[PDB]
Scaffold this motif. Structure first.
Motif, PDB file in Angstrom:
ATOM      1  N   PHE A 162       6.456  -4.749  10.024  1.00  0.00           N
ATOM      2  CA  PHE A 162       7.400  -5.853  10.035  1.00  0.00           C
ATOM      3  C   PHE A 162       8.726  -5.375  10.609  1.00  0.00           C
ATOM      4  N   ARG A 163       9.503  -6.315  11.143  1.00  0.00           N
ATOM      5  CA  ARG A 163      10.828  -6.028  11.669  1.00  0.00           C
ATOM      6  C   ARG A 163      11.799  -7.044  11.098  1.00  0.00           C
ATOM      7  N   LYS A 164      12.963  -6.579  10.673  1.00  0.00           N
ATOM      8  CA  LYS A 164      13.925  -7.480  10.060  1.00  0.00           C
ATOM      9  C   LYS A 164      14.538  -8.375  11.130  1.00  0.00           C
ATOM     10  N   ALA A 165      14.474  -9.684  10.906  1.00  0.00           N
ATOM     11  CA  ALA A 165      15.014 -10.650  11.848  1.00  0.00           C
ATOM     12  C   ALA A 165      16.506 -10.844  11.602  1.00  0.00           C
ATOM     13  N   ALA A 166      17.139 -11.620  12.488  1.00  0.00           N
ATOM     14  CA  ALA A 166      18.576 -11.848  12.374  1.00  0.00           C
ATOM     15  C   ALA A 166      18.932 -12.562  11.077  1.00  0.00           C
ATOM     16  N   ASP A 167      18.008 -13.349  10.531  1.00  0.00           N
ATOM     17  CA  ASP A 167      18.211 -14.013   9.249  1.00  0.00           C
ATOM     18  C   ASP A 167      17.888 -13.122   8.050  1.00  0.00           C
ATOM     19  N   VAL A 182      11.969  -2.522  20.142  1.00  0.00           N
ATOM     20  CA  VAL A 182      13.421  -2.524  20.320  1.00  0.00           C
ATOM     21  C   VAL A 182      14.107  -1.987  19.072  1.00  0.00           C
ATOM     22  N   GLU A 183      15.416  -1.734  19.162  1.00  0.00           N
ATOM     23  CA  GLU A 183      16.130  -1.303  17.969  1.00  0.00           C
ATOM     24  C   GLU A 183      15.988  -2.327  16.857  1.00  0.00           C
ATOM     25  N   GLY A 184      15.981  -1.838  15.629  1.00  0.00           N
ATOM     26  CA  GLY A 184      15.903  -2.716  14.481  1.00  0.00           C
ATOM     27  C   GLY A 184      15.531  -1.934  13.244  1.00  0.00           C
ATOM     28  N   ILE A 185      15.379  -2.673  12.153  1.00  0.00           N
ATOM     29  CA  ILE A 185      14.912  -2.130  10.884  1.00  0.00           C
ATOM     30  C   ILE A 185      13.449  -2.515  10.744  1.00  0.00           C
ATOM     31  N   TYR A 186      12.590  -1.517  10.557  1.00  0.00           N
ATOM     32  CA  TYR A 186      11.151  -1.700  10.537  1.00  0.00           C
ATOM     33  C   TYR A 186      10.594  -1.321   9.176  1.00  0.00           C
ATOM     34  N   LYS A 187       9.531  -2.013   8.782  1.00  0.00           N
ATOM     35  CA  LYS A 187       8.788  -1.686   7.575  1.00  0.00           C
ATOM     36  C   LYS A 187       7.330  -1.503   7.959  1.00  0.00           C
TER      37      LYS A 187
END
Lengths: 111, 115, 115, 111
Positions: free
Chosen positions: A24-29, A56-61
């Protein structure tokens, strides 16, 4: 592919085969959006989850479905899953070592 | 108290002191709702999070704030936190100890479930 | 007592009870000589192995008899035992806890060194 | 080669490079006889320690020289080394994950 998952079984001393993995990737919301999923092969590895372009860059789980793995082997384990959460700013290997009441996870990050 | 959290630091060979821990329980709508929280003591342990009365059968998440722990030591870590997710079971008397061993790019967690 | 051993079972999620532990110290001729021994309690812990008087600076080996532990549970293990080898240091007051987490084909060990 | 050693560094999230490894085999007189030695490569792996012909049944000790590894990086670690002792009766991978005051080791045994 910049993201690989490897899972080992500490009871048998073997790769953990057919382990489901959901990324999973944290969305803007600030919600967890589905990103990619797969299952480990006979080597215990899961390749090809994503591409350099998509990752892309982001927070992943990375959610490793350990309970389903143990239950399919006839064992009632402790954890629902093993969750690995990190920020990406390069190749990431997320490794996990599984026992019915314990797990270890390591990140190997290379160029 | 049926739920205890213990945290160790594999770099310093010490208890992990003043680590924030947040516990959640899954609600009927499948969301995580806050349940209990605290910070580990000088011994790396967090006691008194809950009571038998409140710790009913359910799915619980124990979130250990490893990133802030390493940053307070001046050490760059990989993970945002460590999460331990499990279903509790009232089949007889039961105490849960959630143990975690921390390194900057690795952690392990074990459940010690006793009577 | 400056040296404690604690052992957990990652398969059952429990203390590892009745595990034999043998401690050795390196002698002047480079051989391992017996130093202390015991079996873990119902809590997986082994207290009272030694005293500050006897635990002088030296190289120590803590041998945990993991193979016999798994065989008594009817489980086939890989290792003969787990060995923890370290040099003690009298730089200030110091207590050593040797912790081990056991699976049939894997183990981890950590040192918790406190004042 | 039926015996491979792989070492990871849990502080950096990287292979543990240039780790010395000494393998011993118990002789008939119950002493540890030198068997093979080497050091890990840039991948953290040590290949070619032995051959199928040489790796006969016996009790083996794989000594991973963790203290020298940490000291070469400027760190004072707890353990002298990590020792992995097992009986061989097939491919053995001995994996170790290193921190200054802690290590984990797993055996992956395959056909």
């Amino acid at each position: 592919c910049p993201l690989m998952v490897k899972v080992l079984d500490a009871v048998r001393g073997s790769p953990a085969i057919n382990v489901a993995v959901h990324v999973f990737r944290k969305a803007a919301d600030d919600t967890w959006e589905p990103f990619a999923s797969g299952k480990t092969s006979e080597s215990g590895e899961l390749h090809g989850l994503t591409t350099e372009e998509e990752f892309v860059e982001g927070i992943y789980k990375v959610e490793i479905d350990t309970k389903s793995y143990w239950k399919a082997l006839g064992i009632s384990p402790f954890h629902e899953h093993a969750e690995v959460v990190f920020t990406s700013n390069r190749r990431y290997t997320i490794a996990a070592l599984l026992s019915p009441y314990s797990y270890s996870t390591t990140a190997v990050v290379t160029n």
